[PDB]
């Protein structure tokens, strides 16, 4: 009943226990830039005050599938069809050995990791769950991460505290910090398209936005992420790695680019 990225209950058998995962518009996908359709009318994505997370501690949790961070309802994502509000944010990465841990690809190439910022249509619904199964109910920002030659102070707000939640279900609080700083500096270039959640139930309720520019973290940081979290509640511990879903069929969906 507890699904996993691989194994007997890997992303291959998801469609069985969660039919929706076999939908006609799943995510992530391999974004082929040659098929990308330019749309000069796509308004700039703009995170209103994502450096203003207030005063109260943010919740840093360990699913067993990822590291998730809570976000204040004060973060408002503009530039989209409806008004969205930030709810949570989490990461995806590969195992120690590999350097491919992102969920989306660009022209068949994946990066070291991926950041996902989840929003919901608070304009039309009252909860994140409510919009999780409503058309266009969710909106996710996808930031691809590469290994840089320098330590990223932004990402440390999260990485520096990974030991506090080494085991699954372990929780903790962090001093609020500028989320904005976790995105690439230039957000003009991006791709948009209709998709789904990348984990069961795989609800096809999300409006995706994947940035063209990438964010960077030191090989040290990427390592501290790969080799620190366990996917179990206690010992024996089992490395929570390779937590990304494979590119899904495009099923003839159009993918727009702002550039
Ligand atoms: C995501 O899917 C929705 C619905 O399938 C698309 O909405 C339609 O968009 C076209 C052109 O933009 C309009 O003429 C239709 O009226 C829209 N349908 C309605 C009323 O929802 C939307 O364009 C898709 N988003 C993208 C660009 O991927
Ligand atoms: C309840 C909820 O928000 N679930 C999500 N499941 N997968 C998500 S992801 N990886 O597409 O951002 S969000
Ligand atoms: Zn995700």
Burial (Cβ within 10 Å: 0-12, 13-18, ≥19) of residue 181? middle
Among the bound ligands, the one closest to the CA of 102: 3
Q: What are phi and psi of 6, to 5 degrees?
A: -140, 175
Q: Is the CB of 237 under 6 A from ligand 1?
A: no
**Contact assessment for residue 136 and residue 110, using Cβ atoms and an 8 Å cutoff:** no
- Angstrom CA distances, 60 to 6, 69, 173, 175, 231, stand at 25, 5, 6, 10, 15
Q: What angle do CA 131, 137, 138 make, to 5 degrees?
A: 100
Binding site listing for Zn(2+):
90, 92, 116
Query: Residue 142 and residue 65: Cα distance in Å, rounded?
Result: 17
Centre of ligand 1 to C-alpha 135, Å, is 11
**Resolution as reported, in Å:** 2.9
- Is 1 among the residues known to form the active site? no
Q: Is 71 helix (H, G, I), strand (E, B) or coil?
A: coil
Beta carbon of 208 within 6 Å of any ligand 1 atom: no
Indicate the pairing of strand 190-195 with strand 256-257.
Answer: antiparallel
Sketch out the chain's domains with CATH numbers.
1-259 (3.10.200.10)
Give the CA radius of gyration of the chain.
Answer: 17
> Where is 128: in which H helix or E strand?
helix 128-132
* Atom of ligand 2 at shortest range from CA of 206: 11
Residue 210 CB neighbour total at 10 angstroms: 25
Coil, strand or helix at 248: coil
Instruction: Tell me which long-range contacts 232-235 makes (C-beta under 8 A, separation of at least 24).
Output: 232/64, 232/167, 232/168, 233/64, 233/167, 233/168, 233/169, 234/167
**Residue 1 neighbours by CB under 8 Å, 6+ apart:** none
31 and 191 Cβ atoms separated by less than 8 Å: yes
State the burial class of residue 9 (Cβ atoms within 10 Å of its Cβ: 0-12, 13-18, 19+): middle
DSSP 140: E
* Cα 24 to Cα 13: distance, rounded to the nearest angstrom: 16
User: How far, CA to CA in Å, does 79 sit from each of 7, 47, 193?
Assistant: 40, 9, 14
Q: Which residues pair with 88 in a beta bridge?
A: 70, 118
How far apart CA 114 and CA 66 sit, in angstroms, is: 11
Q: What letter does residue 6 receive in the DSSP assignment?
A: S
Whether residue 256 has its Cβ less than 6 Å from ligand 1: yes
């Amino acid at each position: 009943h507890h699904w996993t990225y691989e194994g007997p209950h890997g992303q291959d058998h998801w469609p069985t226990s969660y039919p929706e995962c076999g939908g006609d518009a799943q995510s992530p996908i391999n974004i082929q830039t040659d098929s990308v359709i330019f749309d000069p009318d796509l308004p700039a994505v703009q995170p209103h005050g994502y450096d203003q997370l207030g005063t109260e501690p943010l919740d840093l949790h360990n699913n067993g599938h990822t590291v998730q961070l809570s976000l204040p309802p004060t973060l408002h994502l503009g530039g989209l069809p409806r008004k969205y509000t930030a709810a949570q944010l989490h990461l995806h990465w590969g195992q120690r050995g590999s350097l491919e841990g992102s969920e989306h690809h660009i022209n068949s190439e994946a990066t070291a990791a991926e950041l996902h910022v989840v929003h919901y249509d608070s304009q039309s619904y009252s909860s994140l769950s409510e919009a999780a199964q409503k058309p266009q109910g969710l909106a996710v920002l996808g930031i691809l991460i590469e290994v840089g030659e320098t330590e990223n102070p932004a990402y440390d707000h999260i990485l520096s505290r990974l030991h506090e939640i080494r085991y699954k279900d372990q929780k903790t609080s962090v001093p609020p910090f500028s989320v904005r700083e976790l995105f690439p500096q230039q957000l003009e270039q991006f791709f948009r398209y209709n998709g789904s959640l990348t984990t069961p139930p795989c609800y096809q309720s999300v409006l995706w936005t994947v940035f063209n520019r990438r964010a960077q973290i030191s090989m040290g940081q990427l390592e501290k992420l790969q080799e620190t979290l366990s996917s179990t509640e206690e010992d024996p511990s089992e490395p929570l790695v390779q937590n990304y879903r494979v590119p899904q069929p495009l099923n003839q969906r159009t993918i727009f680019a702002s550039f």
